[PDB]
Amino acid sequence: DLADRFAELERRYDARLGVYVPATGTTAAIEYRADERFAFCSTFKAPLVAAVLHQNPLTHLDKLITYTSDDIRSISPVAQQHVQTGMTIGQLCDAAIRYSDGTAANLLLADLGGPGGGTAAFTGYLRSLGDTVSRLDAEEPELNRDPPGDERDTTTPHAIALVLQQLVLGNALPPDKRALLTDWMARNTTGAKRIRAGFPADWKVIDKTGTGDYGRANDIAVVWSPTGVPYVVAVMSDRAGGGYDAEPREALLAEAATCVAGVLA
Numbered sequence: 001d002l003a004d005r006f007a008e009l010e011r012r013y014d015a016r017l018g019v020y021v022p023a024t025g026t027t028a029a030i031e032y033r034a035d036e037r038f039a040f041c042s043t044f045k046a047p048l049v050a051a052v053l054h055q056n057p058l059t060h061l062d063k064l065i066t067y068t069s070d071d072i073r074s075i076s077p078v079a080q081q082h083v084q085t086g087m088t089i090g091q092l093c094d095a096a097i098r099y100s101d102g103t104a105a106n107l108l109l110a111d112l113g114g115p116g117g118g119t120a121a122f123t124g125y126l127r128s129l130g131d132t133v134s135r136l137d138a139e140e141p142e143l144n145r146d147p148p149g150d151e152r153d154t155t156t157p158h159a160i161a162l163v164l165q166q167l168v169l170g171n172a173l174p175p176d177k178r179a180l181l182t183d184w185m186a187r188n189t190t191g192a193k194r195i196r197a198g199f200p201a202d203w204k205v206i207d208k209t210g211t212g213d214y215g216r217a218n219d220i221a222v223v224w225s226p227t228g229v230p231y232v233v234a235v236m237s238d239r240a241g242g243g244y245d246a247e248p249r250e251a252l253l254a255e256a257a258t259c260v261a262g263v264l265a
């Protein structure tokens with residue numbers, strides 16, 4: 001029956017909607033176009049941070065990187081200011097999760113090393129988790145620019161909810177490292193109007209946003225009930241009908257999350 005509202009919301013905002021919530025002991029998985037392929041956009045920058053953290057000791061974060069003003073290419077609120085200081089690996093992690101800083105992301109790919117500036121190694125890293133579906137291919141900004149139909153730079157609600165589960169609630173990082181990821185996602189600034197705006201205020205919310213062309217709007221989050229029961233919620237959207245220059249409708253994500261809340265209480 002919840003399938004009738006997702007499709008109802010799909011009809012209202014002229015969109016395609018993806019939705020996965022892993023299952024608990026006490027609630028069944030929520031599925032809508034779950035195993036269907038959506039574009040990452042800026043959602044990759046979350047698992048990327050666990051990638052550095054994991055193949056790197058806690059002393060790495062105080063390593064400094066310098067960069068030319070010809071590396072700065074995507075939206076980069078934090079990067080274009082520090083072009084003369086540099087940014088330590090750690091600051092680049094804060095940047096890339098809290099502000100979606102596009103350059104910071106590209107340098108953290110470079111820091112994984114190997115072919116196609118560290119995309120090979122970063123899909124690499126997704127496979128250690130179980131994800132044999134998702135795959136990053138380009139750097140910022142082409143991964144947002146891909147045409148709808150393309151299998152490149154894509155994941156699924158099913159695939160990415162499961163990755164997140166393992167990184168925040170799971171044990172795919174040791175507790176010391178697991179705390180940085182979660183704190184950075186907990187003071188994200190880009191999420192105000194998506195999953196956060198659909199759940200009541202006494203639920204706590206950590207999230208990493210993504211936006212693209214062809215109407216792409218994306219949120220992956222971990223949420224906590226007033227009693228402290230966690231869950232994982234993945235919402236993904238696009239609007240190819242509207243053109244390459246389609247507008248992304250944020251309301252659609254916040255509506256869908258209110259639907260999910262109804263079910264989780």
Ligand SMILES: CC1(C)[C@H](C(=O)O)N2C(=O)C[C@H]2S1(=O)=O
Nearest residue numbers: 042074075102141144211212213
């Ligand atoms: C600049 C982008 C490629 C992309 C874009 O070009 O549309 N921007 C958004 O809407 C989020 C930012 S981004 O993903 O860094």
